[PDB]
Design a protein around this ligand. Structure first.
Ligand SMILES: NC(=O)C1=CN([C@@H]2O[C@H](COP(=O)(O)OP(=O)(O)OC[C@H]3O[C@@H](n4cnc5c(N)ncnc54)[C@H](OP(=O)(O)O)[C@@H]3O)[C@@H](O)[C@H]2O)C=CC1
Ligand SMILES: COc1cc(-c2ccccc2)cc([C@@H](C)C#Cc2c(C)nc(N)nc2N)c1
Length: 157
């Protein structure tokens, strides 16, 4: 099973200066819950923006760097390698990986952040003509999560 897992704003911003532009604990929980016991595949820049693997799942980094070696991280050097990974694989970012994979994934788990942030990296345009809304769930707005957000599960028609 091949899924995208992304959070993007109203204009599809996903990043600014190698960080996420917003702080949303609800979405971090969502990510942890969805991907625990499974596999994350991410581009080299995305990995480096955090610098350590997320515990309790497989962390896979795509890079052309033949020297890349990080404890608790598995390395791949081709998009083709993704299809050989067993289990439920989540494409975890960043822009380059999403652009390469959006036409290939079975489904998408998207957190829509209902704001407009300054960004330098974007999720690719997509249309609901191509995607069924399996579920759409409003996130809870509170003191620690103060940006409205909606968890979408989209399945390719
Ligand atoms: N809001 C969200 O849900 C998320 C946001 N982000 C954000 O995304 C931004 C980073 O995105 P971006 O700059 O696109 O970087 P990526 O994380 O997509 O990393 C790009 C790198 O991945 C490697 N790579 C990608 N495709 C291939 C390939 N086909 N073969 C070999 N290597 C490949 C290359 O590494 P190398 O150069 O080493 O060869 C490349 O430079 C950050 O701001 C981050 O915060 C990231 C994840 C989620
Ligand atoms: C090094 O590997 C990473 C680990 C994390 C992470 C670390 C702690 C808690 C949750 C996620 C985040 C990332 C970033 C780049 C991401 C993401 C992401 C988020 C925060 N939300 C959704 N909905 N999708 C994503 N791909 C990379």
């Amino acid at each position: 099973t091949l899924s995208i897992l992304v959070a993007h704003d109203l204009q599809r911003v996903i990043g600014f200066e190698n960080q996420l532009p917003w702080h949303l604990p609800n979405d971090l929980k969502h990510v942890k819950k969805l991907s625990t016991g499974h596999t994350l595949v991410m581009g080299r820049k995305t990995f480096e923006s955090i610098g350590k693997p997320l515990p309790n799942r497989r962390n896979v980094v795509l890079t052309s760097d033949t020297s890349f070696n990080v404890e608790g991280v598995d390395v791949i050097h081709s998009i083709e390698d993704i299809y050989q990974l067993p289990g439920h694989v989540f494409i975890f970012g960043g822009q380059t990986l999403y652009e390469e994979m959006i036409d290939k994934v079975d489904d998408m788990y998207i957190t829509v952040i209902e704001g407009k942030f300054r960004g330098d990296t974007f999720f690719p345009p997509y249309t609901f003509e191509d995607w069924e809304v399996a579920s759409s769930v409003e996130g809870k707005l509170d003191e620690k999560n103060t940006i409205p957000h909606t968890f979408l599960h989209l399945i390719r028609k």
